[PDB]
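TEACHING EXERCISE
Course module: macromolecular assemblies
Task: Read the component lines below, then compare them to the predicted structure of the full complex.
Student: A.B.
Group: 4
Components provided:
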Amino acid sequence: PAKAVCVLRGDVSGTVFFDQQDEKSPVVVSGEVQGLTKGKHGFHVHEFGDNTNGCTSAGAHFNPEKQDHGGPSSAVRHVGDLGNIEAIEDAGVTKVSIQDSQISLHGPNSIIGRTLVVHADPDDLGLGGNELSKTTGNAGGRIACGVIGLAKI
Amino acid sequence: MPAKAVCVLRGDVSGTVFFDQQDEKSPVVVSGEVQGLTKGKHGFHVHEFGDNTNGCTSAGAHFNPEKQDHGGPSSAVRHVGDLGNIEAIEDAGVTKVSIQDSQISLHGPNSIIGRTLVVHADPDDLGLGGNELSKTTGNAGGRIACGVIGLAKI
Ligand SMILES: [Cu+2]
Ligand SMILES: [Cu+2]
Ligand SMILES: [Zn+2]
Ligand SMILES: [Zn+2]
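Instructor-supplied answer key:
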């Protein structure tokens, strides 16, 4: 089995774990984010684990299958598309509790060494009918991010 | 195909370190620099976890897939993560990092992607110290900066 972790750096903080039991099974993504503004926040794995230029150098959404942007349940989506995490209140602690079959901790869809990004605005899941929607989901600015690294156990 | 990775060091000192590998079978070339080191040798290793949950402490021990004891990069017995020392020629300067190693890789069993690069306060004795810590940490002491090693653009 495999485990990875991301510690967010930026306007919000938090520790997000990734657990995968077998190469064939989905990845369970858990942990908590603190200091999010109330509301929905876009949440994606971006291609590069590069923070030489803050979250900007993370590049675009991780997209090994060469698709347009969507939500995690969209028929068309980036592998890195994990939708929104939602703060129910201002200045609280948002639980992260996601499972996804596209991302992996092994092989071509492996997210090890890539970057988890939290956004300022809601991910519209690619339903905005413009170029931005098909690329970023109009999630706006990158407010925090971290490189996804191998974790204990 | 050719691979690249990068690590941004944060802590008491800072820096950016690049890793380049032409082939899955070629050595890894490590370049970049570290700013602010005190004059002298400073231990420099890849640690096993890319885990920053408890600062550089949670990066765990030196990356060691071959189950060996600590040494320098040229030691017959070493950790894969053992990259020896970086040496600051002056106080408060910028130290060039210029290393090539064939044990570390950006692919496979020995891949360092998703692991942590750590700079230490004291010199790594390359496992030629006369105590138990030598054969494990090289007596490099405090972890003064670290970063997770991430994939970088071609
Ligand atoms: Cu994003
Ligand atoms: Cu070390
Ligand atoms: Zn996307
Ligand atoms: Zn070692």
